[PDB]
């Protein structure tokens, strides 16, 4: 789902 991509981006950007 393309609509879930930015949530993934937000999580990976928060983590590291």
């Amino acid at each position: 789902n393309w609509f879930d991509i930015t949530n993934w981006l937000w999580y990976i950007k928060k983590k590291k």
Partner: antibody
Framework: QVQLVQSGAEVKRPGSSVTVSCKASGGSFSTYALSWVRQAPGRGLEWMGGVIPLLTITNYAPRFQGRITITADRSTSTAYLELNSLRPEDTAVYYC???????????????WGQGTLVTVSS | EIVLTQSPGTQSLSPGERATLSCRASQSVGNNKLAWYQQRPGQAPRLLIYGASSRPSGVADRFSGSGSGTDFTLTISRLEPEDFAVYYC?????????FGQGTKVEVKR
């Protein structure tokens, strides 16, 4: 607060191509999804497609695939919709819409531009 | 493609009445990614509910979303004058997002 400001109304001849712009301010541009939604006179909303600027990843509705290009320019925080081979049934208000946040993106469209009336006519 | 059906397309209701608006999907909506919008004539749509039941800050708590899978409902607990407007549902649980055709809530007299 995020604000989206679109370019103004345009009259376009049948068969031509239109570019509509959407300039964002007040938030982070690159990592949030920006979509285009249109509304023909007296009709409902129709999702056309969207872009995630950082990744240059577009996602178009099959109805428009082959006739639409959505692009984003981080240098000016502006997104663009191109729609080609215009016909009278493309007369509509075109809106850009950006996903909301809680911040964490929510997918649904919290932030809308003011709309751009594109009239396809001779 | 997921088809969203909003039926009926108009509801005639009285001020102060409860409204329930249905959205039925042709197949299960992934992760309950279903949003509701309000639109008034001359204005852009406004987000009321996302994720089937979550309400953005600023949205009146008289609006509530419920449901899952293929059957979603927007409830307006008590219609205020400004609530007479058009409501759209939208699913974004697949890359091809789709809208319902809308339901106009109009004043019964």
């Amino acid at each position: 607060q995020v604000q989206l400001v679109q370019s103004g109304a345009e009259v376009k001849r049948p068969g031509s191509s239109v570019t509509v712009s959407c300039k964002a301010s007040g938030g982070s541009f690159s990592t949030y999804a920006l979509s285009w939604v249109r509304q023909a006179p007296g009709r409902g909303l129709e999702w056309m497609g969207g872009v995630i600027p950082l990744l240059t990843i577009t996602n178009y509705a099959p109805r428009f695939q082959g006739r639409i290009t959505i692009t984003a320019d981080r240098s000016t925080s502006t997104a663009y919709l191109e729609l080609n081979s215009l016909r009278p049934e493309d007369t509509a208000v075109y809106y850009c819409a950006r996903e909301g946040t809680t911040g964490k993106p929510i997918g649904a469209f919290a932030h809308w531009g003011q709309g751009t009336l594109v009239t396809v006519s001779s | 493609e997921i088809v969203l059906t909003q039926s009926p397309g108009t509801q005639s209701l009285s001020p102060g009445e409860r409204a329930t608006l249905s959205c039925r999907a042709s197949q299960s909506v992934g992760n309950n990614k279903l949003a509701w919008y309000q639109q008034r004539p001359g204005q852009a749509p406004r987000l009321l509910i996302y994720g089937a039941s979550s309400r953005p800050s600023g949205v009146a708590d008289r609006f509530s979303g419920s449901g899952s899978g293929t059957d979603f409902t927007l409830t307006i607990s008590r219609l205020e004058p400004e609530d007479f407007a058009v409501y759209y549902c939208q699913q974004y649980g697949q890359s091809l997002s789709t809208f319902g055709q809308g339901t106009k809530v109009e004043v019964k007299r």
